């Protein structure tokens, strides 16, 4: 084959290997971002469930106070 | 100036493979990105709810304060 053809084939083989490496890196990183945000969201869901519990415990305190007033 | 058919067939193949890799990559990134914006959206929701419920809580504390004062005896 001609020398100019071999160089172009070689160059494209490189760019394809380079590109497959870029895909692996960009995917790894976007999964890493994904795991950070889904954990952030889990912590938020937990803050809300803890707040719901504090709220539910005050409902019961309210009841005990009503029992003292309305008894 | 000519090149071989086999060579051209091989350059074109690689050029196609390279553009497809770029395509595959763009659309996997796009699917991540749309799933992340969908998630940052549920986090916006969850936070508005939290603030809403914090308000219920703050109002229960005021009611508790008022019952403690109302029941309070002298001396």
Curated annotation (Swiss-Prot), chain A:
<comment type="function">
    <text>Lamins are intermediate filament proteins that assemble into a filamentous meshwork, and which constitute the major components of the nuclear lamina, a fibrous layer on the nucleoplasmic side of the inner nuclear membrane. Lamins provide a framework for the nuclear envelope, bridging the nuclear envelope and chromatin, thereby playing an important role in nuclear assembly, chromatin organization, nuclear membrane and telomere dynamics.</text>
</comment>
<protein>
    <recommendedName>
        <fullName>Lamin-B1</fullName>
    </recommendedName>
</protein>
<comment type="subunit">
    <text>Homodimer. Lamin dimers then assemble into dimeric head-to-tail polymers. Ultimately, two head-to-tail polymers assemble laterally into a protofilament with a uniformly shaped rod of 3.5 nm in diameter. Interacts with SPAG4 and SEPT12.</text>
</comment>
<feature type="modified residue" description="Phosphoserine">
    <location>
        <position position="63"/>
    </location>
</feature>
<feature type="cross-link" description="Glycyl lysine isopeptide (Lys-Gly) (interchain with G-Cter in SUMO2); alternate">
    <location>
        <position position="18"/>
    </location>
</feature>
<comment type="similarity">
    <text>Belongs to the intermediate filament family.</text>
</comment>
<feature type="modified residue" description="N6-acetyllysine; alternate">
    <location>
        <position position="18"/>
    </location>
</feature>
From Swiss-Prot, chain B:
<feature type="cross-link" description="Glycyl lysine isopeptide (Lys-Gly) (interchain with G-Cter in SUMO2)">
    <location>
        <position position="2"/>
    </location>
</feature>
<comment type="function">
    <text>Lamins are intermediate filament proteins that assemble into a filamentous meshwork, and which constitute the major components of the nuclear lamina, a fibrous layer on the nucleoplasmic side of the inner nuclear membrane. Lamins provide a framework for the nuclear envelope, bridging the nuclear envelope and chromatin, thereby playing an important role in nuclear assembly, chromatin organization, nuclear membrane and telomere dynamics.</text>
</comment>
<comment type="subunit">
    <text>Homodimer. Lamin dimers then assemble into dimeric head-to-tail polymers. Ultimately, two head-to-tail polymers assemble laterally into a protofilament with a uniformly shaped rod of 3.5 nm in diameter. Interacts with SPAG4 and SEPT12.</text>
</comment>
<feature type="modified residue" description="Phosphoserine">
    <location>
        <position position="65"/>
    </location>
</feature>
<feature type="cross-link" description="Glycyl lysine isopeptide (Lys-Gly) (interchain with G-Cter in SUMO2); alternate">
    <location>
        <position position="20"/>
    </location>
</feature>
<protein>
    <recommendedName>
        <fullName>Lamin-B1</fullName>
    </recommendedName>
</protein>
<comment type="similarity">
    <text>Belongs to the intermediate filament family.</text>
</comment>
<feature type="modified residue" description="N6-acetyllysine; alternate">
    <location>
        <position position="20"/>
    </location>
</feature>
